[PDB]
Each structure stands twice: as structure tokens, then as C-alpha cells.
Amino acid sequence: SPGIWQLDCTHLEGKVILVAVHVASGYIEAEVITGQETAYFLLKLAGRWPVKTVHTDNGSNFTSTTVKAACEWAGIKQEFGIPIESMNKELKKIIGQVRDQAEHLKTAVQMAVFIHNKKRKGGIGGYSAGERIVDIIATDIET
Amino acid sequence: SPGIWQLDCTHLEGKVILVAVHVASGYIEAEVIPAETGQETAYFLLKLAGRWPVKTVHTDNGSNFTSTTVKAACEWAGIKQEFGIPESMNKELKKIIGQVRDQAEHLKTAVQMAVFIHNKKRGGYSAGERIVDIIATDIET
């Protein structure tokens, strides 16, 4: 299902990291950060990918006027219950291996996102998450 | 033109907007950045190359060749910089930003609304449909 994403948060060095997983592929986006910030994040994602339903596991985004606005503008359905916590874990491990390469945590997070999406999902051969999401989307339009 | 992008700067409301165009599809990504070409240009490129295949980046002035961080970002991710960008997306974008500007407080929000529209609206195929088709085609190769 090409447009289904899970959105979660996580924390490092006193910053919050917003994390969005395309569930069907394992492709992820992320950024360091409010409700405006999540709204902006969602708008940016939806203008790059098919963002149709976003699952979150707590009440926080349902009380954010800008998120609600971004979702209406963009055509996103928020849904509670999510339907990727091993995701936040591998991201941080990768952030561990790159952190020394970067002066800003933000850069480290984006190095780790890069690695995640570009490595072979299976270790060897097959697709990366970055390839799968495009593959998934190509086939849904085709249909 | 499978991993070939154009990079440029456009200006609105006293701000600089960085814009990368996937040449074969016309798909664009954009963000508000500093006058300085440095760390935040490197970061935009790192992020872009994490979402799409970015192998060669064209520019047609010298600004993008004066930052050590941009060079380190290109090395890290496997990006070649080429001079020569021989694509006035900047003009339809600003059209659209002006269309949607009232719908948002922050300019950068209006930029992202205009990116969304430009990439989604076709007829034949939208830029967003094209880039996916291009990349999927290639993978199968």
C-alpha cells in the first residue's frame, strides 16, 4: 500500500528527532526539531511522496492546529494506532557510527538516513528501501 | 539523466531559496537557505541524495565551488559537481508561491506548497510520476 506511513519521535543530545517510515518499503525520512514543525515535515513529505495515511501512537498530533491544517491542505488522513521501533534503534546505532564525522547532530541523522535507505535491505543483493519505495510507487501508478 | 540534477538559487521576500531540479523529469526539491553557500547547502544535498539517486549536480556559476563543506558532502555521498547547466523552473515556482502565499504564515511553507503543486499537477504525467517512472525503469535495467 503505497501511501501508508508511520510517524514517531525520538531523542538524542536533548533534541527530538521526527521519524517517518514508509511501512511497505522500510524507506524513512527524519529530521531534528513543535506542531508547526511536524506540519512542515508532513507537508514536505507529502509533496515528495504519496502520503495518504499517517499512523501515530499517541494523542499529541490530534491536538495540533497546524498538523490538522497541513493534513487538510495535503489530503492526509491521520489515524491512531501504528500499524519501526526497531527502526528508531537501528537509526541510533548508525548515528553512533557517524556521529564523530559531523559537527551537527542533524547532519549525523541525515548520514544515518542515507545509509538506511541506500544499503541493501537484505545485506546483499535485492533492493534498498530507497529502491523499493519507488518500485512500489511505480507499480501503483501503473495500475 | 537518471541521477543528473540541476542546482540553483532564486530569491523571494528577502530570502534565498535553493532549488534542485531532476532534469529528465522536472521534479524539484526546494528549501530556504543562507546567502552563504556552505554548511546548509551541503546539508540540503546530503538530504536530497538520501532520498533519490544523486550522482551529478550541475551549476552554472561559481558559488557552489567555494565551500569546503559542500565538497565534503559531495565526497561523502558520491556526488559529482559539474559546471554548466545548459530550466526556468524558478519562474513557475514563484508563480505558484504567489498563488498560495496567503494560505500560510511562513514563506518556507508557501515554497513547500508550491513544490507539492509543481510536482503533483500534470494530461500525461506529473514531474512526480515521471521521476518515479524514470528511476523504476532504470532499476529494472
Ligand SMILES: Cc1ccc2oc(C#Cc3ccc(C(=O)NCCOCCOCCNC(=O)c4ccc(C#Cc5oc6ccc(C)cc6c5CC(=O)O)cc4)cc3)c(CC(=O)O)c2c1
Ligand atoms: C560531510 C557533511 C555533509 C553534509 C553536511 O551538512 C552539514 C550542515 C549543516 C547545518 C544545517 C542546518 C543548520 C541550521 O539549521 N542553522 C540555523 C537554523 O536554525 C533554526 C532551526 O530551526 C528551524 C525552525 N525555525 C522556523 O522558523 C520554522 C518556522 C515555521 C515552520 C512551519 C510551519 C508550517 O507548516 C505548515 C504546513 C501546512 C500548513 C497548512 C501550515 C504550516 C505551517 C505554519 C505556516 O507557515 O502557516 C517551521 C520552522 C546549521 C548547519 C555539515 C556540517 C557539519 O555538521 O559537520 C555537513 C558535512
